[PDB]
Amino acid sequence: MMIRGIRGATTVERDTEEEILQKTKQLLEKIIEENHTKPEDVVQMLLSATPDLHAVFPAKAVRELSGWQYVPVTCMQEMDVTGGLKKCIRVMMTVQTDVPQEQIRHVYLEKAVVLRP
Amino acid sequence: MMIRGIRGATTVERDTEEEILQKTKQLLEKIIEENHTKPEDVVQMLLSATPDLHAVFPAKAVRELSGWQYVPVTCMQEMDVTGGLKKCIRVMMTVQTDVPQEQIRHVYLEKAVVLRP
Amino acid sequence: MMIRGIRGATTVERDTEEEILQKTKQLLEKIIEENHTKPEDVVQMLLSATPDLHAVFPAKAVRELSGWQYVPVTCMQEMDVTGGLKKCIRVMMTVQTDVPQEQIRHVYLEKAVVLRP
């Protein structure tokens, strides 16, 4: 069955574990709501952070989510772009879905709304 | 139908938006030419850049490909390997395909030709 | 069948090519053993390293695995997290498998055993 990436992006106001995890959870919850995603259908997830965030792996937020303890995830550094959005967390959630590419609901929150296409 | 990763790598001579966008675009076009890839069959793409490149996200080049506006992409920092190739942009394009693993056509351009297996 | 990610993590004591390749090869072989993985069923692999490792791309270890020469791989920098595990190498190996999400065998070796959930 076909697989598709779902993108998310958000921002935090400060580099703290509380804020990174809160904003990451809110971003995940929104992706799950808009795409009706069940954890068993998630192939894997990639989270990234800009290099001004160091307090915690955003992946930690994934176990705040009931039923998502078996979803494999790893956390990379976003490319450091001159004048790029600061304090930014992104998600690439790869899922089994029949929803067409045009209809996948990518999610941009907080100051990352500027990254919308 | 199976999913397969297609790898690309290229280089720029300088850290400028024009160079990054043109060279990323050309790399994507070459991958698309050699593998006959249609955007609807692309699960997601991951782009990376060595930590000497900062001018622009290479993903911006993807929006210059007509029809590819719904392909999800994210960027990341490539690891900094001592003696590794400088000013390097890489692609992992994940596609649905029946082409056997050994027949997938991975693409190496510019100074990256030295990375070719 | 479905597509699923398999996670691995390990550590090295020194930033040298010999140790990075040896510990990476050992981690890959353990993942392969526990999951019965054949190279042709691997969609692609992502390797990451913390920013304190520079001697070699861990991907080089994949090429000393007989039969794995056509598996696409790329490397990236792990997010730098304060107090995180140092000298850490992770893999995300995407495979076609019938194994349920909760029965995939993720692998944690050396000092990364602490990451085991």
Coordinates of C-alpha atoms in Angstrom, one line a residue:
Chain A
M1 CA 0.0 0.0 0.0
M2 CA 1.2 3.5 -0.8
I3 CA 3.2 5.6 1.7
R4 CA 3.3 9.4 1.9
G5 CA 5.2 12.0 3.9
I6 CA 3.3 14.5 6.1
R7 CA 5.1 17.7 7.0
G8 CA 4.7 19.8 10.1
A9 CA 6.5 22.9 11.4
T10 CA 6.2 25.0 14.5
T11 CA 8.3 27.4 16.6
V12 CA 9.1 27.8 20.3
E13 CA 9.6 31.1 22.2
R14 CA 12.4 29.7 24.4
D15 CA 14.8 26.8 24.4
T16 CA 13.4 24.8 27.3
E17 CA 12.3 21.2 27.6
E18 CA 8.8 22.3 28.7
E19 CA 8.3 24.5 25.7
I20 CA 9.9 22.2 23.1
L21 CA 7.8 19.3 24.2
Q22 CA 4.6 21.3 24.6
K23 CA 4.9 22.8 21.0
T24 CA 6.0 19.5 19.5
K25 CA 3.0 17.7 21.1
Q26 CA 0.6 20.3 19.9
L27 CA 2.1 20.0 16.4
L28 CA 1.8 16.2 16.4
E29 CA -1.8 16.4 17.7
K30 CA -2.8 18.7 14.9
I31 CA -1.2 16.5 12.2
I32 CA -3.0 13.4 13.7
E33 CA -6.4 15.2 13.8
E34 CA -6.2 16.6 10.3
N35 CA -4.9 13.4 8.8
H36 CA -6.8 10.8 10.9
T37 CA -3.4 9.1 11.6
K38 CA -3.3 5.9 13.6
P39 CA 0.1 5.1 15.1
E40 CA 0.3 1.6 13.6
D41 CA 0.1 3.2 10.1
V42 CA 3.2 5.3 10.7
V43 CA 6.3 3.9 9.0
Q44 CA 8.7 6.2 10.8
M45 CA 9.1 9.9 11.8
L46 CA 11.9 12.4 11.4
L47 CA 12.0 15.4 13.6
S48 CA 14.5 18.3 13.2
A49 CA 15.4 21.4 15.1
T50 CA 17.3 24.5 14.2
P51 CA 20.7 24.7 15.8
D52 CA 19.5 27.3 18.4
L53 CA 17.5 24.5 20.2
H54 CA 19.3 22.2 22.6
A55 CA 17.1 21.5 25.7
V56 CA 15.6 18.2 24.6
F57 CA 15.0 15.8 21.7
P58 CA 11.6 16.8 20.4
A59 CA 11.0 13.0 19.9
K60 CA 10.4 12.8 23.7
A61 CA 7.0 14.3 23.0
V62 CA 5.9 11.3 21.0
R63 CA 5.5 9.2 24.2
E64 CA 3.3 11.8 25.7
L65 CA 0.9 10.4 23.0
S66 CA -1.1 7.4 24.1
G67 CA -0.5 4.5 21.7
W68 CA 2.6 5.9 19.9
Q69 CA 5.3 4.2 22.0
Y70 CA 6.2 1.9 19.0
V71 CA 6.6 4.6 16.4
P72 CA 10.2 4.8 15.4
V73 CA 11.6 8.3 15.4
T74 CA 14.9 10.0 15.2
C75 CA 16.0 13.7 15.5
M76 CA 18.3 15.6 13.2
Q77 CA 19.7 19.1 12.9
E78 CA 18.0 21.3 10.4
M79 CA 20.2 23.1 7.9
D80 CA 21.3 26.5 9.3
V81 CA 20.1 29.0 6.7
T82 CA 21.1 32.6 6.8
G83 CA 18.1 34.6 7.8
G84 CA 16.0 31.4 8.2
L85 CA 13.2 31.1 10.8
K86 CA 14.7 30.7 14.2
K87 CA 13.7 28.3 17.0
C88 CA 12.0 26.0 14.6
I89 CA 10.9 22.4 14.9
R90 CA 9.9 20.3 11.9
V91 CA 8.3 16.9 11.4
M92 CA 8.3 14.5 8.5
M93 CA 5.9 11.7 9.4
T94 CA 5.8 8.9 6.9
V95 CA 2.5 7.1 6.8
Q96 CA 0.5 4.4 5.0
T97 CA -2.3 6.2 3.4
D98 CA -4.5 6.2 0.3
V99 CA -5.2 9.9 0.6
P100 CA -3.9 11.5 -2.6
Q101 CA -0.7 13.7 -2.4
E102 CA -2.7 16.9 -3.1
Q103 CA -5.0 16.2 -0.2
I104 CA -2.5 15.4 2.5
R105 CA -2.8 17.9 5.3
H106 CA 0.6 19.5 6.2
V107 CA 0.6 21.6 9.3
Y108 CA 2.3 24.9 10.0
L109 CA 1.8 26.4 13.5
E110 CA 3.0 29.4 15.5
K111 CA 5.6 31.5 13.6
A112 CA 6.2 28.6 11.1
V113 CA 3.0 29.7 9.3
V114 CA 5.3 31.7 7.1
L115 CA 6.7 28.4 5.7
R116 CA 3.3 27.5 4.2
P117 CA 3.2 27.2 0.4
Chain B
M1 CA 4.2 -2.0 -4.9
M2 CA 7.6 -1.6 -3.3
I3 CA 9.1 1.7 -2.3
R4 CA 12.7 2.6 -3.1
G5 CA 15.2 5.4 -2.3
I6 CA 17.0 7.2 -5.1
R7 CA 20.1 9.0 -4.2
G8 CA 21.6 12.1 -5.8
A9 CA 24.6 14.3 -5.0
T10 CA 26.1 17.5 -6.4
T11 CA 28.3 20.4 -5.5
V12 CA 28.3 24.2 -5.8
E13 CA 31.4 26.3 -6.3
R14 CA 30.1 29.0 -3.8
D15 CA 27.5 29.5 -1.1
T16 CA 24.9 31.6 -3.0
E17 CA 21.3 31.2 -3.7
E18 CA 21.7 31.1 -7.5
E19 CA 24.3 28.3 -7.2
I20 CA 22.3 26.3 -4.7
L21 CA 19.0 26.5 -6.5
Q22 CA 20.4 25.9 -10.0
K23 CA 22.6 22.9 -8.9
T24 CA 19.8 21.4 -6.8
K25 CA 17.3 21.9 -9.7
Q26 CA 19.7 20.2 -12.2
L27 CA 20.3 17.3 -9.8
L28 CA 16.6 16.7 -9.4
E29 CA 15.9 17.0 -13.1
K30 CA 18.6 14.4 -13.8
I31 CA 17.2 11.9 -11.3
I32 CA 13.7 12.4 -12.8
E33 CA 15.1 11.9 -16.3
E34 CA 17.0 8.7 -15.5
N35 CA 14.2 7.1 -13.4
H36 CA 11.2 8.5 -15.2
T37 CA 9.8 9.6 -11.9
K38 CA 6.4 11.3 -11.6
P39 CA 5.7 13.5 -8.6
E40 CA 2.6 11.6 -7.6
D41 CA 4.8 8.5 -7.0
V42 CA 7.2 10.4 -4.6
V43 CA 6.6 9.5 -1.0
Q44 CA 8.9 12.3 0.3
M45 CA 12.3 13.7 -0.3
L46 CA 15.2 14.5 2.1
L47 CA 17.8 17.1 1.1
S48 CA 21.0 17.6 2.9
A49 CA 23.8 20.2 2.8
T50 CA 27.3 20.2 4.2
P51 CA 27.7 22.8 7.0
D52 CA 29.6 25.2 4.7
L53 CA 26.3 26.1 2.9
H54 CA 23.8 28.6 4.4
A55 CA 22.5 30.8 1.7
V56 CA 19.1 29.2 1.0
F57 CA 17.3 25.9 1.6
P58 CA 17.8 23.6 -1.4
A59 CA 14.2 22.6 -1.1
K60 CA 13.3 25.9 -2.7
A61 CA 14.4 24.4 -6.0
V62 CA 11.7 21.7 -5.8
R63 CA 9.0 24.4 -6.2
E64 CA 10.7 25.3 -9.5
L65 CA 9.7 21.9 -10.9
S66 CA 6.2 22.2 -12.3
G67 CA 3.9 19.6 -10.8
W68 CA 6.1 19.0 -7.7
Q69 CA 4.4 21.4 -5.4
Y70 CA 2.8 18.7 -3.3
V71 CA 5.9 16.6 -2.8
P72 CA 6.9 16.8 0.9
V73 CA 10.5 17.7 1.5
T74 CA 12.7 18.6 4.4
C75 CA 16.3 19.7 4.7
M76 CA 19.0 18.6 7.1
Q77 CA 22.7 19.2 7.9
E78 CA 25.0 16.5 6.5
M79 CA 27.7 15.4 8.9
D80 CA 31.0 17.2 8.8
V81 CA 33.6 14.5 7.8
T82 CA 37.2 15.5 7.9
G83 CA 38.4 15.2 4.3
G84 CA 34.9 14.9 3.1
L85 CA 33.5 16.7 0.0
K86 CA 32.8 20.4 0.5
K87 CA 29.9 22.4 -0.6
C88 CA 27.8 19.3 -1.2
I89 CA 24.1 18.9 -1.6
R90 CA 22.5 15.4 -1.4
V91 CA 19.1 14.0 -2.2
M92 CA 17.2 11.0 -1.0
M93 CA 14.0 10.7 -3.0
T94 CA 11.7 8.0 -1.8
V95 CA 9.5 6.6 -4.7
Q96 CA 7.0 3.8 -5.3
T97 CA 8.5 1.6 -8.1
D98 CA 8.8 -2.0 -9.4
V99 CA 12.3 -1.3 -10.7
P100 CA 14.7 -3.8 -9.0
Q101 CA 17.1 -2.3 -6.4
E102 CA 20.2 -2.9 -8.5
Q103 CA 18.6 -1.1 -11.5
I104 CA 17.6 2.2 -9.7
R105 CA 19.7 5.0 -11.2
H106 CA 21.4 7.1 -8.6
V107 CA 22.9 10.4 -9.8
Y108 CA 26.2 12.0 -9.1
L109 CA 27.0 15.4 -10.7
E110 CA 29.6 18.2 -10.5
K111 CA 32.3 17.4 -8.0
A112 CA 30.2 14.6 -6.4
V113 CA 31.2 12.3 -9.3
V114 CA 33.9 11.1 -6.9
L115 CA 31.1 9.8 -4.5
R116 CA 29.8 7.4 -7.2
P117 CA 29.9 3.8 -6.1
Chain C
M1 CA 3.3 -6.3 3.7
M2 CA 3.8 -2.8 4.9
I3 CA 6.9 -0.5 5.2
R4 CA 8.4 0.1 8.7
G5 CA 11.4 1.8 10.2
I6 CA 13.9 -0.2 12.3
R7 CA 16.0 1.9 14.8
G8 CA 19.5 1.2 16.0
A9 CA 21.8 3.2 18.2
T10 CA 25.4 2.6 19.4
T11 CA 28.4 4.6 20.6
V12 CA 32.2 4.8 19.9
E13 CA 35.0 5.6 22.4
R14 CA 37.1 7.6 19.9
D15 CA 36.5 9.5 16.7
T16 CA 38.5 7.2 14.4
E17 CA 37.6 5.6 11.1
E18 CA 38.3 2.1 12.5
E19 CA 36.1 2.4 15.6
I20 CA 33.3 4.2 13.7
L21 CA 33.2 1.5 11.0
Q22 CA 33.5 -1.4 13.4
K23 CA 30.7 -0.3 15.8
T24 CA 28.5 0.7 12.9
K25 CA 29.0 -2.7 11.2
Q26 CA 28.3 -4.4 14.5
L27 CA 25.1 -2.5 15.0
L28 CA 23.9 -3.1 11.4
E29 CA 24.7 -6.9 11.7
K30 CA 22.7 -7.1 15.0
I31 CA 19.7 -5.3 13.4
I32 CA 19.9 -7.7 10.4
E33 CA 20.1 -10.7 12.7
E34 CA 17.2 -9.8 14.9
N35 CA 15.0 -8.7 12.0
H36 CA 16.0 -11.3 9.4
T37 CA 16.5 -8.5 7.0
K38 CA 17.5 -9.1 3.3
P39 CA 19.1 -6.1 1.5
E40 CA 16.6 -6.1 -1.4
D41 CA 13.8 -5.4 1.1
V42 CA 15.5 -2.2 2.4
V43 CA 13.8 0.9 0.9
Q44 CA 16.6 3.1 2.2
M45 CA 18.7 3.9 5.3
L46 CA 19.5 7.0 7.3
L47 CA 22.5 7.1 9.5
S48 CA 23.2 9.9 12.0
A49 CA 26.1 11.0 14.1
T50 CA 26.5 13.4 17.0
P51 CA 28.5 16.5 16.0
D52 CA 31.6 15.2 17.8
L53 CA 32.3 12.5 15.2
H54 CA 34.2 13.4 12.0
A55 CA 36.6 10.7 11.0
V56 CA 34.4 8.9 8.5
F57 CA 30.8 8.6 7.2
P58 CA 29.2 5.7 9.1
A59 CA 27.6 4.7 5.7
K60 CA 30.9 3.3 4.7
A61 CA 30.2 0.3 7.0
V62 CA 27.2 -0.6 4.9
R63 CA 29.4 -1.2 1.9
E64 CA 31.4 -3.9 3.7
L65 CA 28.2 -5.9 4.1
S66 CA 28.1 -8.5 1.3
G67 CA 25.0 -8.0 -0.8
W68 CA 24.2 -4.5 0.5
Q69 CA 26.0 -2.5 -2.3
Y70 CA 22.7 -1.3 -3.8
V71 CA 21.0 -0.2 -0.6
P72 CA 20.7 3.6 -0.6
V73 CA 22.0 5.4 2.4
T74 CA 22.7 8.9 3.5
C75 CA 24.2 10.4 6.6
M76 CA 23.1 13.4 8.7
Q77 CA 24.0 15.2 11.9
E78 CA 22.0 14.2 15.0
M79 CA 20.4 17.1 16.9
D80 CA 22.8 18.5 19.5
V81 CA 21.1 18.1 22.8
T82 CA 22.6 19.3 26.1
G83 CA 23.5 16.4 28.3
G84 CA 22.7 13.9 25.4
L85 CA 24.8 10.8 24.8
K86 CA 28.1 11.7 23.2
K87 CA 29.8 9.9 20.2
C88 CA 26.5 8.3 19.2
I89 CA 25.7 6.7 15.9
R90 CA 22.0 6.0 15.0
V91 CA 20.4 4.2 12.2
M92 CA 16.9 4.3 10.7
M93 CA 16.5 1.4 8.3
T94 CA 13.3 1.4 6.3
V95 CA 12.1 -2.1 5.3
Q96 CA 9.3 -3.9 3.7
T97 CA 8.0 -6.4 6.3
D98 CA 5.0 -8.3 7.5
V99 CA 6.1 -7.8 11.2
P100 CA 3.7 -5.7 13.3
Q101 CA 4.9 -2.4 14.5
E102 CA 5.1 -3.6 18.1
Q103 CA 7.2 -6.6 17.1
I104 CA 9.9 -4.9 15.2
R105 CA 13.3 -5.4 17.0
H106 CA 15.0 -2.1 17.6
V107 CA 18.7 -2.4 18.6
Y108 CA 20.7 -0.5 21.2
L109 CA 24.3 -1.3 21.9
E110 CA 27.3 -0.1 23.9
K111 CA 26.5 3.1 25.8
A112 CA 23.3 3.6 23.9
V113 CA 21.6 0.8 25.8
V114 CA 20.4 3.7 28.0
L115 CA 18.2 4.9 25.1
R116 CA 16.3 1.6 25.2
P117 CA 12.7 2.6 26.0

